[PDB]
Assembly symmetry: D3
Homo-oligomer: 316 residues x 6
């Protein structure tokens, strides 16, 4: 298969554009050095907010935002090409529509300097996050060692429906870049394992440790944790075998859950019952997902973190 | 809240109707004794296949099948009334449509002796199981201590969308009665935790132990295992449940409120959040056109490996 | 040091005197067989209720109550002499005072067939147990391999003050014989460790497994679990105990010598330490005036919830 | 309930008063930032020695000692008032008696800027610590979300009687601020759990991390660990605490109500229970005559191994 | 790869040849039933003493001994050919040299009903076991899914040199059949992992549970435990083995390729590596002069503790 | 016994000899401070590469190499003599033969500043390491508290034969100093446990933490982990070692005395056992012809992947 490296990167305090640039060059130095230390490494993963940090007073301002693609994404692209590796990076992207808030964006770059995947955080961690819900869906790209790669961002990994989507579109190695799984420590480990098992795919996940807030995890396609980090600069590495995930989905019967979902009870009814019989699926597809207890909920907007509840662009 | 008890019941080898009757009387005696031992208990849970066992050569036959409701369910209901507890039972149910295979059914009986919940296994554990896919959806009923109870069956608990459905309909205590989802022992503990966390609800799960194949588990609404049984028959897994705390988490929490975020993405940047999830499989599954890219090359798409016909209809009689 | 064996005994259903004698013969059989398989073993421990079971309808009756010493204890003593081992046994003891309820009693017998220790359960597990609180304090006796043995019974192990008392009187090997204290499974493991650590002594604990309940446990004098049994009947928990090293720790340690510190607080600043601990409950409990600020608002202060009368005196005979 | 936050604070090297003021402002800074990061936090806890460090060569000198209250405590008071939180702070406090060594002191300040609890370490960690044994008992104050707060300091937590004392005076949230949980780390985890379980109360404990000796732990009233920090500086251990659940447990429970059982032995057979625990050490300690049998042969009974005089009085100027 | 099954078989008390025959039929019954339940299984493994039990008073007598091959082994072979699986069995083999004690033997029979591997326990568990040290070395045969099977017996697994020898002869799936890994439970788990890691091969190991012991264990070639059974009789430990990945690791690994490094020390500084390991015990053991410096003062060097004669030859007849 | 201290030393980025000089002074300061912190400590252990780092582009140059003995070793001897401790240090040693690559060396210095053990890395971690295979075998020296000390270096601890050799020469405390326990994390923990259990000796092992790449581990002679550090720089793993108890187990044990069994197989059946192990690899390795059957198809057999020449001699000067 292929060797993967997940880096428990310490993002510093970011005060200006000068600091963002230091992060970028620190990320590039670490990318080249990881490759130097592990010549066999083909996939190197950096966490969410590793480029621009988490300055909640500044992160919405023009100085703290970037374009994808831009001159900084091309610096990473140049770095991946020179090192001959796949690289995963995090960039808070300026929305081309100026009446809308910026995006939380992840990108994947191949060993030739080509951006082969772009994803915008579909589920921002609210009420703390002011990012606009993504519009690129859950994309999948071709990676090393026969892997089909997809990336989600921190809070995204808590939604099992999203993990299903990546797998539904071919993904067998599910990448989760993460900024803060703080106080949500147990559940970060839990969901990484469940996202793997539910869909018969690998999960490679890493949280920012900057400087002591993160962890790093690689799970087998059966949900077994293979590698686990504890510290800033911890490099979580592991050997991935995408073909084994592909083989399980093709040759498994008893625990082929991803297949059973759309082909319920196929032994009694040839082909299986296609209608899952779930009202929430039908409501969400139509776009009227409503929980019975919504009217009595206390936090339905980001007012508690000093954000306006009017909408549009703010913090520019 | 309330006190729950889950029984790692030993079902024996079932060779006839006499064994089934013995199993019913065994389950009844266990119910009264569990109430006698734990006076505060309000919910007693027996695992899948506890009534009828797993005689794979006879379990599709008419002698091994029961009606819901019938004289067997009335004995369980009589017991629930006399012991003053909520009961959860398993019954392989004779399909009213004679052209179709029987159902794998779970029922909940209240302290009055009434079936307040009936559920047919939506996802049979194929290729080994010949049961017909359930047609009653995922129902939710009122339980003790302000709980909303929903029951799934063994293999059902491996599907996270089903745990979402129960919660979507109000469930704060998700019950998983389980037959023999063995060798998937790691993933049984895993999914019970994830089913709880994803939906901010309790999970109370139990498997058959008999003759040494069981496990028993109660999980908190944050996904933390509160109580855990080993692999011994007759092991009673009990614990105190606080359904209001699960409800309060759903109402008060912001950062970890994942069940809300699914249908209301980014409610800080966009007012009320984006209602469209942007997921192709959701739209495909709703229309019934759910298809995986690798379906053509799959090896197991029927139950011929275990001797069952591939043609469909009623068989095994 | 010496080798110990803690037996996760299965006491069957006890319905008559005939079943008690069968238990007695089973225990004697096991003790002889344990020595046969483990030639170097010097201490063999049986759990609470192993002699008489837990028939809560009959356990206060004359048929179910024995004398200490009596013809039954002499049989245990005979076996201990024949096998040349130390034996720890459980007996529900008839109260010499017929106006008081029977005691929950444990004994230790030496390889000479003599009762060297007799303990009556100081803290009966209420409100479920009708046993009279013991009057013999917390005794300590000489044992094998340089040990000073003391025994507590199930619920007694939840009381840290009791573990301190045994240790205060010289005990370096703390035995906990446990009946049915189930559901409190995590806290059984926790307290065995903490009882050991607080006092710098070994703990050797065993619970009844019969049909599947108990988990034998051997802890080092620093609170570390050395041997842990599962939940199966007939599991024999064995380990090599070195009592001299517990003594050595008590003599040589400075930083973690907590048992000394309690009576000599801050001895560096004040030579010999402050002897007054500064705790009100200690002085209250000593004068028998220990009272919690919330005692008037408590709901369970009698055994009526299990059916026992609140009047006092002898009942259930 | 209420949200708590315990900082695995790094104390740097402290060589002068200059460094002490540096730490004070660092703590104030951390207090404000934690409230900003966690909007609903009501209780913020800092470890032992966070203000003054552990410069054992200098920590007894007048430059390294403060008064309670003083201008340093006032800076903390102001910070808590501005942040609207309860703060827990460490101060090595100059002794009012000039012939006695300084006290190792913990203080709790409320959101109104008032010190509502002042505790002096009752059991200094001998022979390494030269602090005078505290003279203000084990105090309890009113806290947020209906909590009754009490604080003990590192080594104190190894004494179960001190945990008993706090609970006896109403405490339902037991705070442990610590400056040594290295190589005693396993036992630090163990005792935080046992202190909680024994007394049916929460424990919130945090050890100094700087810079790598740290720890952070929240335990539920049944002794289960809810949150666990690793060994890094600046790790903030946070969780939601429900003191009313601990209160409910103390009132509702029968079987596991060990704190009540201590004073009312076997209340079923003897109504109201036996008030005399029947423990010699309780009576000895109350009278100031607590004496271990092996005390005369103990190696360490003074602080000479760390270079402290054995004569007492005021030293280390 | 292939699917393996390890049966935690319960051996009963064995008192005669009639009981041995019962055990043979039970094993055959289990083999057909396991193949029926797991249609894909290609290797079924039974533990040490499953045929004959551990009647120490009788296990050396002619009645309790069998021939390999004999009519009993051909009954096992008949089962393997009918069920179409590889089977691993335990037989206490009568020594063809009647002046020597019987062997403790393990055999592997292929799906064509033929013995393809025969092994005699090289390291009997002394002083409890009276079996003659095996003379057949450590053989390796071809198994299912491209595996190279080798078998060792319980105590054998505690010797790392033996695990090396099997791998040195091609083994990538190391089978360990076990009678008692009791009170050696922790070290059984430990060495099953280490035998795997040291040699870059799978280990599949199962112990008797008969009545409660066996801990079925499948380890990955990097030493990680993949499947783990508890202590119950009849537990079937199953998992998929991929023997070719163990082969690939041996051919492709540089850094952690320890099996190669042993005979090729520092090949970067010295091409081909230094072939002499520089170990005196390796040279001593090859020459049969392995001697520990403390052997003169050792207590147990014969079997007198378990009643065995110390002068050798045939005994127990 | 004695108190050991294993420092999870942070290796800095070493660019010059000045940086090497900083490391030496850092280590000396650490050594003095650890003795001051723990007055009872007798053994202070520093990891591999602590003196010189891992500058793979410069670590073969003469500037980055030292002599044993040398002025740098005498500075450690100075420190050890002043502190009155046993010290363990790592030095990349200039090869006295100019045509050979330098050695990876470890030394033990007694309380009188004398080198009492010199060991050269027998198994350099290939392909990454260019160090020459050690020519001093596995030496054993007298240590504190009755200990026989032996030292191995990182990758050495992966070879069970080497751990056997040390014990074969009297070692009861096996020290492992390591550079990277990274991506080898689990296997480092496993082998430290197995090295202990296989040979009935203690293992004290520590890895470089600096910037976050290590752990520290003390295992009992039965393979049980007693103390475990995390991944932080400057963590000091300490514990009490009792070498006499490892000796006692070797003298007193029968059943689990595996180190004796290796040279005396089946000694009950055949007095004194069969001295011939019956293992081909032992005889091949003693003869210098260790040859695995797959060696011809192996990929990595040199250090070209890390840029090292494939013809030998002295390179990187």
């Amino acid at each position: 298969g292929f060797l993967v490296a997940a880096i428990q990167f310490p993002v510093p305090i970011v005060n200006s554009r000068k600091d963002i640039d230091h992060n970028i060059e620190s990320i590039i130095r670490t990318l080249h050095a990881t490759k130097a230390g592990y010549p066999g490494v083909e996939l190197i993963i950096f966490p969410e907010y590793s480029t621009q940090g988490l300055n909640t007073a500044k992160w919405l301002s023009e100085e703290f935002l970037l374009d994808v693609p831009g001159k900084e994404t091309e610096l990473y692209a140049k770095a991946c090409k020179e090192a001959k590796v796949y690289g995963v990076f995090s960039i808070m992207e300026r929305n081309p529509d100026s009446n809308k808030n910026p995006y939380n964006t992840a990108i994947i770059i191949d060993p030739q300097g080509e951006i082969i995947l772009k994803y915008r955080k579909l589920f921002p961690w609210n009420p703390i996050e002011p990012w606009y819900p993504g519009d690129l869906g859950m994309p999948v790209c071709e990676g090393p060692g026969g892997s089909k790669l997809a990336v989600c961002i921190s809070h995204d990994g808590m939604i099992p429906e999203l993990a299903r989507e990546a797998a539904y579109k071919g993904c067998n190695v599910y990448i989760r870049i993460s900024g803060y799984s703080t106080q949500v420590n147990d559940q970060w480990i839990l969901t990484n394992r469940s996202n793997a098992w539910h869909n018969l795919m690998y999960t490679v996940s890493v949280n920012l440790a900057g400087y002591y807030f993160g962890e790093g995890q690689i799970c087998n396609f059966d949900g077994t944790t293979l590698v686990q980090g504890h510290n800033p600069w911890e490099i979580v590495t592991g050997e991935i075998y995408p073909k084994m995930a592909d083989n399980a989905r093709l040759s498994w019967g008893l625990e082929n859950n991803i297949y059973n979902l759309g082909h319920r009870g196929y032994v009694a009814k040839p082909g299986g019952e296609h209608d899952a019989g779930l009202t929430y699926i039908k409501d969400l597809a139509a776009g009227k997902y409503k929980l019975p207890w919504e009217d009595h909920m206390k936090i339905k907007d980001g007012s508690i973190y000093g954000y306006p509840t009017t909408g549009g662009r703010f913090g520019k």
